[PDB]
Design a protein around this ligand. Structure first.
Ligand SMILES: *Cc1c(COP(=O)(O)O)cnc(C)c1O
Ligand SMILES: *Cc1c(COP(=O)(O)O)cnc(C)c1O
Lengths: 416, 417
């Protein structure tokens, strides 16, 4: 009856509370890559608690890092001063980030880190006397398209790539003098349905931004910290962001810490005598929280000593083969994967690739079937996301993929 | 030495000119009670409660234990489409201690996120119920409307100031309410603007006008929340019932980032419907309802109960007032403002010009640096020296911090004429 109480006082993020009331779920504990509910039923953490859990739950080293920091101080401010763990973590993050990035600006969430990146971009140009550069390009302000090869007319990766790059170039051509920055997810569009960008695409946008003197903001909130088989996904194409947002996996999934990385050139445009009004007057009260910073330092220590990134890249090879036989199912239209970042797009006809009408709630229905079959994930429309913890074993991966295959079949054959 | 050099090499600090940090850096290593200790071993009174969030002091044993216990279960699992135990229990406790009309808890990571969520809730509320014209908001200082600043008003009278500002609000609402979704206001004290305490009856007046003109009242309790003004929430001072209320900072006793937007049932129910009907509030964050933060918040609220912090703040605030009135007598202290443990001393170049020092003399900053050498941290708000001591501060500690502040103020300010 914590259950009937839950229905009374909560308002959950991104969720229709009527859906919640009809199918409540309350998690009590976790161990390894499984979480347990208040009835004792276990589930594989098939989405890494929304793309942030790295080493599974109750990871000893992580538990210990927080316990240790408690023994010193939980929180002191970064407003006008600093603390030991935030400073140490800043140096460590800079060691592993793309080389052009030299500064760490903390915040609480990935959304905050992105918002800061945009404000930085905007004020940067104003600070250096170019107040005309105030517009933004959001790749899906002006908007420019990212390749969606699966639903393209050519079905051709680099045709699609080149055509999208041509359209961005046109946008850049006639408005660059007015544009402060372009924002883009690194390599994989998450919320859009785990859409992996064709080779050379991200590199191409970097090139255009440099050419037309526009700051490139790269969102690594989902992709960062090993998720795609590289520490940061922009390593796949050797891209150097001007500003880079990270969060989620940074703390191994334990606590809210997020970061906006900037280059030295951006930082110095705000560095001056106070009187000169160059200061970046933004931030948050919990910025650089010791508890969160302490757990992130140990998270990173583990990446190094557990060779997590190599292990992810290795395991991703067999994972691909498991997924392709998933492709065989009558309603699996497309399989998309980069590292442990995967999605299975569901469709009513794989020949015409016509989707189900949204009102058949296929994605939701699959997620519920997987739930009863003992696995958590979150659907994106009718794309079944699969983002297993980075510590997942080959065995655990094959078990999670099997549950996906069964749920998809059991649901979609009724067409639900 | 190299910690200090590394600090200058890779950090970009919030709300701070890094050149200022570079010439006077400060790195904190630990905390005990209401004191923090830097890496050189120098100790400082936490005069601003680590920027208005520290409640019981640092390394509060019960707080530490609460987090260790929760670690033994699970650190984080999602509230996206499901929930967890600590977040569920905390929500019930929060509803019990919050204004009665507020029945729903929507978690986020920060006070800013919780205010952003309140705005989006209000906007979509009106659209959901078929009045999409209600798309603007009022921000008290979107239309802006003025809050009473009694100290440098014509009359210097609270009632007169209150009544005038309410008259301006009423006219704005009379003329534009059909286009307005919500009004946003800090509860009783404007913090960042200089710890400006609202005159008696003003907040209630705002609530009445909002109700009268069908505008949702968003009350920001991020600074005032959790005992800071000598009530659990500041809107208790005038018995006001917000439509939406933002809370953060002190919620966890100052340990961890968790935040809440409270809503009424009428608001909640406008988003509750068959999914196909498109009433859903599609916003939120990945760390919403984080177990570690919710666990420490539950123990924070337990300690509020078992030590009645709120009554103690209200009691100690009486003597604090006397100590501040003493400060008020210094040549360059123009005004003293206080509600509970939420205080500011406004510094002026002339007491009955109340002419401020030119901003470029950096008086507030200079005073804050002098307090630092004197063993006490705070942050100035322009030339207002904020004083927001942890709620657990003793009468003796309160007198000690006020004395450092007094000394710092005359020491700096006597050299500026
Ligand atoms: C602290 C504060 C905020 C912002 O909260 P953050 O956690 O720093 O993002 C909002 N409103 C008021 C009144 C505050 O004091
Ligand atoms: C998670 C996510 C965000 C937002 O992060 P929050 O912590 O939920 O605010 C931003 N960008 C991307 C790519 C994300 O995956």
């Amino acid at each position: 009856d914590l259950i009937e109480k839950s229905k009374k006082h909560l308002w959950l993020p991104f969720t229709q509370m009527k859906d919640y009331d009809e199918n409540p779920l309350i998690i009590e504990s976790g161990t390894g890559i499984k979480v347990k509910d208040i009835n004792g039923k276990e589930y594989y953490d098939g989405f890494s608690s929304v793309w942030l859990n790295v080493h599974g739950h109750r990871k000893k080293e992580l538990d210990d890092a927080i316990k240790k920091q408690l023994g010193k101080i939980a929180h002191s401010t970064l407003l006008g001063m600093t603390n030991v763990p935030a400073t140490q973590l800043a140096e460590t993050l800079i060691d592993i980030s793309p080389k052009k990035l030299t500064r760490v600006f903390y915040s609480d969430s990935g959304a905050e880190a992105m918002e800061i990146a945009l404000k930085m971009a905007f004020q940067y140009w104003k600070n250096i006397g170019k107040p005309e550069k105030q517009k933004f390009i959001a790749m899906k302000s002006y908007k420019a398209p990212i390749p969606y090869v699966y639903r393209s007319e050519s079905g051709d990766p680099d045709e699609c790539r080149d055509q999208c790059l041509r359209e961005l170039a046109q946008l850049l051509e006639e408005h660059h003098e007015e544009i402060a920055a372009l924002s883009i997810e690194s390599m994989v569009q998450g919320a859009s349905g785990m859409i992996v960008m064709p080779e050379g695409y991200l590199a191409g946008v970097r090139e255009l931004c440099t050419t037309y003197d526009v700051l490139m903001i790269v969102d690594e909130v989902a992709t960062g910290f090993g998720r795609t088989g590289k520490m940061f996904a922009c390593e796949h194409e050797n891209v150097q962001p001007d500003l880079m947002a990270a969060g989620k996996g940074i703390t191994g999934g334990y606590l809210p810490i997020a970061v906006t990385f900037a280059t030295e050139d951006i930082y110095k445009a705000f560095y001056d005598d106070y009187e000169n009004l160059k200061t970046f007057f933004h931030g948050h009260s919990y910025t650089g929280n010791q508890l969160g910073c302490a757990v992130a330092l140990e998270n990173l220590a583990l990446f190094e000593s557990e060779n997590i990134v190599e292990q992810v890249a290795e395991k991703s090879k067999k994972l691909h083969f498991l997924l392709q036989d998933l492709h065989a199912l009558p309603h699996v239209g497309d399989i998309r994967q980069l590292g442990f970042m995967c999605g299975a797009e569901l469709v009513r006809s794989k020949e015409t690739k016509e989707p189900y009408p949204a009102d058949r709630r296929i994605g939701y229905k699959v997620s519920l079937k997987m739930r009863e079959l003992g696995m958590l994930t979150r659907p994106l429309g009718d794309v079944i996301a699969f983002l297993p913890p980075l510590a997942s074993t080959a065995e655990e991966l094959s078990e999670m993929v099997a549950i996906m295959k069964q749920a998809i079949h059991e649901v979609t054959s009724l067409e639900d």
